[PDB]
Amino acid sequence: SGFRKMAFPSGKVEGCMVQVTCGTTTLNGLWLDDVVYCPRHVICPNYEDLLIRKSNHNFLVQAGNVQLRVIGHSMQNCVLKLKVDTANPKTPKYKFVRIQPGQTFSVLACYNGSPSGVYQCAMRPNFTIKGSFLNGSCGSVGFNIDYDCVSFCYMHHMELPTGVHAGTDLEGNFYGPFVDRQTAQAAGTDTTITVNVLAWLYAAVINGDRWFLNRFTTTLNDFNLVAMKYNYEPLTQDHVDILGPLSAQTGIAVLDMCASLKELLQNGMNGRTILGSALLEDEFTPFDVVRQCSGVTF
Amino acid sequence: SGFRKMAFPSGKVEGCMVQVTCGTTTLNGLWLDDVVYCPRHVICTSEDMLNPNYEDLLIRKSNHNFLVQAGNVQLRVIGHSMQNCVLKLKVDTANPKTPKYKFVRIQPGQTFSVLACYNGSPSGVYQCAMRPNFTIKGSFLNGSCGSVGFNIDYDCVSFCYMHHMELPTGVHAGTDLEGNFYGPFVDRQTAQAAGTDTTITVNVLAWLYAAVINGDRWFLNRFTTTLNDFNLVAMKYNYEPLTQDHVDILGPLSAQTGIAVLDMCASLKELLQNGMNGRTILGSALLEDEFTPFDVVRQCSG
Numbered sequence: 256s257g258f259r260k261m262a263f264p265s266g267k268v269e270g271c272m273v274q275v276t277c278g279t280t281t282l283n284g285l286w287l288d289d290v291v292y293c294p295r296h297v298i299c300p301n302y303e304d305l306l307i308r309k310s311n312h313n314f315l316v317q318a319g320n321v322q323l324r325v326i327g328h329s330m331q332n333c334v335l336k337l338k339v340d341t342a343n344p345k346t347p348k349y350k351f352v353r354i355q356p357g358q359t360f361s362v363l364a365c366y367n368g369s370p371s372g373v374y375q376c377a378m379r380p381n382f383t384i385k386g387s388f389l390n391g392s393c394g395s396v397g398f399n400i401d402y403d404c405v406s407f408c409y410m411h412h413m414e415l416p417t418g419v420h421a422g423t424d425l426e427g428n429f430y431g432p433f434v435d436r437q438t439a440q441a442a443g444t445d446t447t448i449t450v451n452v453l454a455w456l457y458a459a460v461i462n463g464d465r466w467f468l469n470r471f472t473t474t475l476n477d478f479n480l481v482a483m484k485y486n487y488e489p490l491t492q493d494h495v496d497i498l499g500p501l502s503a504q505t506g507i508a509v510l511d512m513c514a515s516l517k518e519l520l521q522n523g524m525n526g527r528t529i530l531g532s533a534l535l536e537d538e539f540t541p542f543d544v545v546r547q548c549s550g551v552t553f
Numbered sequence: 554s555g556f557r558k559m560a561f562p563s564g565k566v567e568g569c570m571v572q573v574t575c576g577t578t579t580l581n582g583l584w585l586d587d588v589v590y591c592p593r594h595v596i597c598t599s600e601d602m603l604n605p606n607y608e609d610l611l612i613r614k615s616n617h618n619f620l621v622q623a624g625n626v627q628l629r630v631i632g633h634s635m636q637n638c639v640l641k642l643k644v645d646t647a648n649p650k651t652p653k654y655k656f657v658r659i660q661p662g663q664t665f666s667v668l669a670c671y672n673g674s675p676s677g678v679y680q681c682a683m684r685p686n687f688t689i690k691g692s693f694l695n696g697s698c699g700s701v702g703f704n705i706d707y708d709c710v711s712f713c714y715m716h717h718m719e720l721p722t723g724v725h726a727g728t729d730l731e732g733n734f735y736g737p738f739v740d741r742q743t744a745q746a747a748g749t750d751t752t753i754t755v756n757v758l759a760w761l762y763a764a765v766i767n768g769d770r771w772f773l774n775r776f777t778t779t780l781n782d783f784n785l786v787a788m789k790y791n792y793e794p795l796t797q798d799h800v801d802i803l804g805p806l807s808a809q810t811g812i813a814v815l816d817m818c819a820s821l822k823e824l825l826q827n828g829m830n831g832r833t834i835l836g837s838a839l840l841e842d843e844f845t846p847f848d849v850v851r852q853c854s855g
């Protein structure tokens with residue numbers, strides 16, 4: 256029993272964290288094979304113009320107490336790739352994957368190439384992440400672990416004026432309509448990740464919390480009219496299919512659980528809590544719920 | 554900016570997780586140097602758990618009755634001893650991934666990270682606190698026994714908890730790494746119940762200071778309180794008494810925000826009376842109590 260916000264074990268990623276220094280700027284890098292990946296703003300804009308003026312010895316890369324020698328440098332979108340003379344002996348089996356809003360991942364927050372914390376979070380529908388980051392965190396990465404393969408999905412680049420965070424995939428493409436520049440940028444109006452809330456309601460049922468259940472069902476169209484009114488993301492037939500195993504396990508059809516959510520949105524919790532929470536949690540996907548409620552290991 | 558429930562990076566602990574098998578029972582062990590630590594109930598059958606005599610059960614065991622697996626490698630047990638509720642299995646190989654470590658016993662209200670494991674393999678990491686009733690509200694299934702709680706300060710891992718059992722309310726009980734249980738619990742299937750749980754007051758105040766540091770001031774008020782008047786109100790909401798030690802501990806946060814501890818206590822009294830009125834504090838609709846004053850400073854300052 257119990258339901259916690261749980262991150263993947265960070266060990267495979269900790270062995271890849273390095274410190275990258277260029278001039279006065281110091282941030283984090285990801286050392287995989289003989290390449291160190293980091294945000295391109297470490298050179299700071301006309302990034303092609305700034306990068307051409309740099310030589311290999313302008314970048315100081317530190318892996319623990321060992322200095323790595325940079326033998327090449329190139330740019331791919333908003334990520335800087337620093338070729339080093341040594342392949343990382345702790346390189347895990349890995350992939351670079353771009354994730355969709357609503358998908359969750361673990362973030363290994365780092366400062367000066369040293370991991371300080373690990374937390375779980377979701378890519379919001381407005382493409383921001385509600386993280387916990389201070390100056391020097393840039394270059395910290397987001398990942399998922401499937402079997403023994405680490406899928407790197409996020410690299411931290413900046414904090415927006417509302418305190419939320421913006422970054423790229425490991426190919427340097429931003430999530431959301433952001434640019435790596437000191438300029439007026441704002442996150443769009445956020446919405447609730449509906450399929451994730453339903454997954455968390457199934458996790459509550461699995462843990463013995465049933466007060467919110469009711470005899471009612473709904474059509475997918477009637478629920479989506481309600482979701483739009485409460486700034487909830489539309490629920491697709493794909494989402495309904497994805498919730499299938501949880502629906503079969505608890506004996507509560509997905510549209511039956513949707514009628515609980517529709518009543519919770521129009522009436523509130525009425526002093527009650529679900530899994531110790533007074534708000535509807537949306538940072539657990541249907542796969543996270545199955546993985547945690549069945550003890551899948553890495 | 555931002556405030557998250559944050560666990561320590563688990564790498565140093567992942568390299569210590571092993572699988573321990575004795576008969577039909579399989580649980581997790583912590584391999585440090587040439588010793589594997591695990592709950593002593595691994596020697597029990599489910600028909601022994603009601604009233605086990607661990608000295609009697611252990612004396613009947615030989616080294617080859619314990620199968621220890623570190624990844625795909627079998628470790629050879631060359632000795633076995635019991636220390637309180639923990640079994641110590643001497644092995645013929647020192648763990649090359651042994652980090653700098655300490656065994657520390659923690660007090661209620663203290664937080665730590667849990668590396669949840671099954672069959673010696675880590676599956677997840679989460680942050681939690683020792684409750685005032687000595688239980689932990691974890692996320693554990695059968696086979697998680699032997700999973701450990703830790704903190705990392707500098708490069709030293711301080712092991713503070715080893716999971717042993719789930720109580721009937723779904724909460725968990727365990728020991729420090731010397732085998733001494735937290736709370737009035739015993740490693741037996743006898744009827745045991747956790748005492749009434751209470752809110753960790755010093756932790757809620759620390760989290761209200763974190764909210765102020767992140768620009769949230771809606772809950773502040775022009776009032777102050779005596780320490781005694783605060784405790785008389787707080788007790789009525791099942792909140793732990795706040796001691797002068799707690800007031801002293803909140804001193805740095807009080808100096809940093811410019812809000813005296815007894816001034817923040819009056820905000821907490823008001824919040825308990827009014828509720829949140831549709832508002833949130835640090836994205837939460839409830840008062841959070843699993844961040845200590847030390848966690849708040851570490852996360853907000855480095």
Ligand SMILES: CN(C)C(=O)N1Cc2ccc(Cl)cc2[C@H](C(=O)Nc2cncc3ccccc23)C1
Pocket residue numbers: 296388389390391392393412413414415434435436437438554
């Ligand atoms: C936020 N700020 C006023 C800055 O000094 N920045 C300006 C800026 C502009 C563009 C880009 Cl791509 C990066 C940055 C930097 C940036 O966002 N880094 C930070 C990341 N995460 C948490 C941060 C908390 C505090 C400070 C800085 C953080 C540095």
Ligand SMILES: CN(C)C(=O)N1Cc2ccc(Cl)cc2[C@H](C(=O)Nc2cncc3ccccc23)C1
Pocket residue numbers: 256594602693694695696697698717718719720725739740741742
């Ligand atoms: C709770 N129960 C009736 C059991 O199966 N047990 C009885 C029992 C009694 C004493 C001691 Cl020291 C250990 C145990 C075992 C136990 O608590 N293990 C579990 C640990 N954590 C989460 C668990 C979720 C589910 C099941 C079992 C969990 C096994």
Ligand SMILES: [Cl-]
Pocket residue numbers: 658659660663
């Ligand atoms: Cl302590």
